[PDB]
Design an enzyme around this catalytic site. Sequence first.
Site, PDB file in Angstrom:
ATOM      1  N   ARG G   7       0.833  -1.460  -0.067  1.00 52.96           N
ATOM      2  CA  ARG G   7       0.045   0.252   0.001  1.00 52.96           C
ATOM      3  C   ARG G   7       0.681   1.296  -0.099  1.00 52.96           C
ATOM      4  O   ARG G   7       0.215   2.242   0.167  1.00 52.96           O
ATOM      5  CB  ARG G   7      -0.968   0.080   1.206  1.00 52.96           C
ATOM      6  CG  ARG G   7      -1.855  -1.149   1.210  1.00 52.96           C
ATOM      7  CD  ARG G   7      -2.559  -1.341  -0.191  1.00 52.96           C
ATOM      8  NE  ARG G   7      -3.709  -2.207   0.261  1.00 52.96           N
ATOM      9  CZ  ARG G   7      -4.227  -3.046  -1.134  1.00 52.96           C
ATOM     10  NH1 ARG G   7      -3.576  -2.730  -2.368  1.00 52.96           N
ATOM     11  NH2 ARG G   7      -5.286  -3.746  -0.977  1.00 52.96           N
ATOM     12  N   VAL G   8       2.199   1.059  -0.109  1.00 54.89           N
ATOM     13  CA  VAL G   8       3.051   2.265  -0.122  1.00 54.89           C
ATOM     14  C   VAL G   8       3.458   2.499  -1.654  1.00 54.89           C
ATOM     15  O   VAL G   8       3.738   3.636  -2.396  1.00 54.89           O
ATOM     16  CB  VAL G   8       3.959   2.259   0.811  1.00 54.89           C
ATOM     17  CG1 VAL G   8       5.119   3.433   0.605  1.00 54.89           C
ATOM     18  CG2 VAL G   8       3.421   2.213   2.192  1.00 54.89           C
TER      19      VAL G   8
END
Lengths: 177, 277, 105, 104, 52, 52, 140, 140
Positions: G7-8
């Site tokens: 999710r980064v």
Amino acid sequence: EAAAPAGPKEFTEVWNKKAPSTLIVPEFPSNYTAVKAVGEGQVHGDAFPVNFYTPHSILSQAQKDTVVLPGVDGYFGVKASHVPTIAQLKPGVVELHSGAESEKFFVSGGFAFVHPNGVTDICVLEAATLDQVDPAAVKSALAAASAAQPTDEFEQAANRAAIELYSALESAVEAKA
Amino acid sequence: SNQAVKQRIRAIKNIGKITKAMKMVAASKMKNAQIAVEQSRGLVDPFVRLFGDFPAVNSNKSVVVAVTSDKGLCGGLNSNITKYTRATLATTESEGKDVVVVSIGDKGRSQLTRIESQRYQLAIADTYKVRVTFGQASLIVEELIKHNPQSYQILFNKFRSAISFKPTVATILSPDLLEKQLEDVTGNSLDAYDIEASHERSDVLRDLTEFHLGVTLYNAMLENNCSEHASRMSAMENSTKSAGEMLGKLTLDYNRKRQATITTELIEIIAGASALM
Amino acid sequence: ALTGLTVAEYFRDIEGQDVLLFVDNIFRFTQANSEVSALLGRIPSAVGYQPTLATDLGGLQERITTTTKGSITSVQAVYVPADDLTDPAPATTFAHLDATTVLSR
Amino acid sequence: ILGMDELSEEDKLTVARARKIQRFLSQPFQVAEVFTGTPGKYVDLADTISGFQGVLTGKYDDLPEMAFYMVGDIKEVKEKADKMAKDIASRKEADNKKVSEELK
Amino acid sequence: ILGMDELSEEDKLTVARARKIQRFLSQPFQVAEVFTGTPGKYVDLADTISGF
Amino acid sequence: ILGMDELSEEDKLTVARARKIQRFLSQPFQVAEVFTGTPGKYVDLADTISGF
Amino acid sequence: VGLSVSRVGSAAQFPGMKQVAGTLKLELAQYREVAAFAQFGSDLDAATQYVLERGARLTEMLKQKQFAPIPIERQTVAVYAATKGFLDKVRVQDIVAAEEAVISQVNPAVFKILKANGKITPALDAHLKAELRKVKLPGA
Amino acid sequence: VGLSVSRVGSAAQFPGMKQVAGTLKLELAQYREVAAFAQFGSDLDAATQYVLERGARLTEMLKQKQFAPIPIERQTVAVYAATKGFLDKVRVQDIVAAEEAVISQVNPAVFKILKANGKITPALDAHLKAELRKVKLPGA
């Protein structure tokens, strides 16, 4: 008049209108039968295909040339291309013919169709051949049948069927050549 | 704590043994009751050869029977023909006619008296306890011709193979109501046949249609019995697979709990001994 | 096991051979080192094994290798306690195993 | 261990309504839209009570289970069951081809 | 549960090959010939790959 | 899982007999009259051997 | 694919791979709605045969042998061919050969354009669909 | 029987027992594999019914009362009377007059021969089957 063409392929479109598309179309018993009545053929000479059926056993699906059936107007022989008929059978002996060899089954009733494509179909409910029946209990059964006759309609119809079947079975056990 | 997971393991292990036994039981029952299904397929041939096959007929009354099962580990058979029953029944009721729905087998009386309840007059069961006979099916057909509809729809699963069960609808037109009308082709197609009966054609057709109803009803419940055995043979394989998968996960859970148990008891003993030593 | 490995290491380093080394029940090596660690007053690790478990196995298993002079190939019998492959002794033994030969009844 | 075909008819309705209400509890977030793509949904309280009344009483046994999944309110359930049945009818809409285009 | 009768020949060539493969994994050992009579066989790697 | 309906009258009888035995092992106690109500029973040894 | 997230680097994705891989992950998400109960449990639909015989292609597309990493411009073209529908008539046994055939037979100018522009431009997807319809997918 | 091991095994047992208990442990293992079918009503394919009756009588043959141990030549003939099919194949309400009827009715010379040779010789199994066929069971 033939203004309503019902059938399996006409059922499919109305089933695609009113039943949902989640399910495949149901089968019909005419999808499992390769042989029909009006679709010509199956004779190809002097033989013709017979179908001797009981509900519990298929007795013959071979090709005979002469079939002797015990119709209610009397015995009659079915040769290669008989007239199309629907013959109600009484208790009697069905005789199949392959030539020199013969099969003689004693049936209990039922029907027999001859179809316009030369096939025949013998539809009985119990067909015991003559060595499986004993000649000792047929006279005991007729003596126990034709003596005690109730005047009630159901029991006297059963008694008439009893004396007809047991008389045909007594006339069939000693009439082997 | 750690004993409940072991008793649940002992539950699922003999559940898997039960279902592995039941799969071979249903497989032997499918093997023994296959030859009768093959024998009874013959007599339904001459009646659809003679009377044809006309499912989408416009009638005034129709007895629809759905041949369900008796015991219910079949896994998606008795509900699939309930779906097929309503799917073939909504197709053929748009004439404002009356419809009688019957079920053979008491796993259909539990599934049909809530979807079509007021049109459900008869429920038949126990037809597979000893065996399926023709006198039994003839009596069932006699209670079907107690009322006199113009059609007889038979919903059953045709035993195509041990894998595939095609649900099959079979129709029987009652003689003077629909059969003498649905055969007219510039005259009639039945007039090619020379009737060799005692009384008239209106009675030999009556006897033929009652006998055709009995024949295809006997074959219908025999085919449905073999499809019941062959679907139970697959549903119990799915239950062995599921109760082996659940057992394999629960074994790992028990092993984690066992390892954590020895670790926490040992840590308690060391913490007790380090306060004294 | 270090004694037997030293007898194999003389055949590896000096003779220059491809020697085999059979350790019957490497789990008993683990269990004996766990008992030695428990008798020395050391605090046990997870499920009851020594805290030095990975390094006591690695002090043995890293000397079983192929060098430029020879090789030691090791066939170790492996017992699995309570048939738990996630028990610390088989899980620590399996990090060194290059093959597996299952013999079944 | 047995499948849904051995459940009672009253319990299959319980399983269907529960699989509807446990998709309907899920919701997209405005802070999760950066890695999920779907826009977030703020749902008022009366919309939540009015939606779960309708799924409890049986007003939405028509709509499929995935129509309840990751939607805002009970309006968006019906507006997703529309898009789920336009799309299965969008198997036969056209054959997409862009021709005589390379010199535009 | 069914038998060799309902096995397809596409699923019977696999049986007829796997049976002789699992036979061909067996091999007599030299250290057992002092009490088993049959001599032991040393199979090369290339002979193993060719013969399988 | 099955329902006790197919056990062919040898395992269906050993369920009913063992259930009668389970209920027959119970006994009202003299000290338990003040929270059950039923009077207590003393059952002698030859009187329970024949009864079982 | 159901459990592993990132999710980064989701915002730090190569565009073009972000153009196709979102649809790839959505199709692999709806592939796991029929995962191992295609006809194993009770029944098969044969309308969702397409999601099974497309998720198998997207699975066999992502298989990759060891010590052979791929540049990202040759991965987005392979997932473009696997997703837009250029490999549905290839059998599942030879999609790993079809991928290397696509990478070998498509001219290497599209790789340089996709690597320099950093996205499949509307000027590029037409030439890519042109070069993707003249590839000799083996078998079939 | 499934969880009891002997690592010394068959190399340290009675040679009269060694030829007869080898069939016994295989029949008992086959009975353990099929032991879920035993409490079923619909009778199976008669190959599993044969082992389910045979092993259920063999597990009754291994029963023993307390503080009355048996000599090895009597247990050998008792296992020979059950693994060779001589056992109570009539309906099994004849048990008490059937279990020890073998060791109480077969003449005690064969115990002397079996103890002395330690083996069921080819000159003894003929009289063993002969004496096992002429068992009385006078209680029925």
